[PDB]
Amino acid sequence: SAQQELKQRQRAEIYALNRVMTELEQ
Amino acid sequence: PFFVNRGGLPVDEATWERMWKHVAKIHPDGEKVAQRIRGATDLPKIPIPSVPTFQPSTPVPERLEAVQRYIRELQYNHTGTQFFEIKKSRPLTGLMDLAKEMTKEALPIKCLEAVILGIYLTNSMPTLERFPISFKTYFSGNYFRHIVLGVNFAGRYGALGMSRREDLMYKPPAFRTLSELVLDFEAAYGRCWHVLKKVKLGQSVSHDPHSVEQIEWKHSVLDVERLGRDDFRKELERHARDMRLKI
Ligand SMILES: *[C@@H](C(=O)N[C@@H](Cc1ccc(O)cc1)C(=O)O)[C@@H](O)C(=O)OCC
Ligand SMILES: [Cl-]
Known part of the structure; x- marks a missing residue:
């Protein structure tokens, strides 16, 4: 599913970003 | 300040670019964070957290620990974009649809999303009562707002949230009174140099996920500094009594 693919690609970038931003907000 | 995703999932082009533009402003590195992540093909595959389900022999306090562990696994959302729009006046059944989607899509969350999830995940526990508790605090010339899900089991009080x-x-459901639970939160705020200004207490939420009733977020509003310690306690115990009598 193209929509499912988009959501999986986005979720990976969201969690990669969240790690960086969490490390920043310590 | 936060942006809210209002187009559902997947995040549309405008909302996704807005999120990255926001990151570039906030993060000292700025554009290099996006350069490293956007389009990267080696990013970690994050497991979808398993929604907790309970045997009938598991005691409710142990279930609450598992619900909180689940909420925590989603992670606190530090991206600057909230991925689910929460309209607090929605009928419960629509907020429960949203909670289901939160478990399916498994994205980071903040305090209000956590409250909705805590309801969704404890509707299977009729011997537990759930009611929102909201806080308004003050630090360094600014106000902060926070929300947790108050819970009541076997005459004790606890809380779920993010x-x-x-x-x-x-907070494990071990506090003998609602007063003791809220005063614990007040002390925790004091320790990180916030002054507690207001507490807002909701009413108990139906365990029917198809209920059309609204959540009542601000049934009781307590001005902490004006009431003073003794009347603060008195009002808190009055809200707790009303809830128990109404059940
Ligand atoms: C809930 C929320 O995220 N609350 C934050 C508040 C906060 C506390 C301390 C610092 O330093 C910053 C922010 C939290 O407890 O982490 C809020 O996002 C929401 O959804 O609605 C609140 C009414
Ligand atoms: Cl206010």
């Missing part, structure tokens, strides 16, 4: 601070969310 905060960036460990002592501003989960």
Whole structure:
């Protein structure tokens, strides 16, 4: 599913970003 | 300040670019964070957290620990974009649809999303009562707002929720009174140099996920500094009594 693919690609970038931003907000 | 995703999932082009533009402003590295992540093909595959389900022999306090562990696994959302729009006046059945989607899509969350999830995940526990508790605090010339899900089991009080601070969310249902639970939160805020200004207490939420009733977020509003310690306690115990009598 193209929509499912988009959501999986986005979720990976969201969690990669969240790690960086969490490390920043310590 | 936060942006809210209002187009559902997947995040549309405008909302996704807005999120990255926001990151570039906030993060000292700025554009290099996006350069490293956007389009990267080696990013970690994050497991979808398993929604907790309970045997009938598991005691409710142990279930609450598992619900809180689940909420925590989603992670606190530090991206600057909230991925689910929460309209607090929605019928419960629509907020429960949203909670289901939160478990399916498994993205980071903040305090209000956590409250909705806590309801969704404890509707299977009729011997537990759930009611929102909201806080307004003050630090360094600014006000902060926070929300947790109050819970009542076997005449004791606890809380579920999500905060960036460990002592501003989960409380095991061990507090003998509602007063003791809220005063614990007040002390935790004091320790991180916030002054508690207001507490807002909701009513108990139906365990029917198809209920059309609204959540009542601000049934009781307590001005902490004006009431003073003794009337603060008195009002808190009055809200607790009303809830119990109404059940
Ligand atoms: C809930 C929320 O995220 N609350 C935050 C508040 C906060 C506390 C301390 C610092 O330093 C920053 C922010 C939390 O407890 O981490 C809020 O996002 C929401 O959804 O609605 C609140 C009415
Ligand atoms: Cl206010």
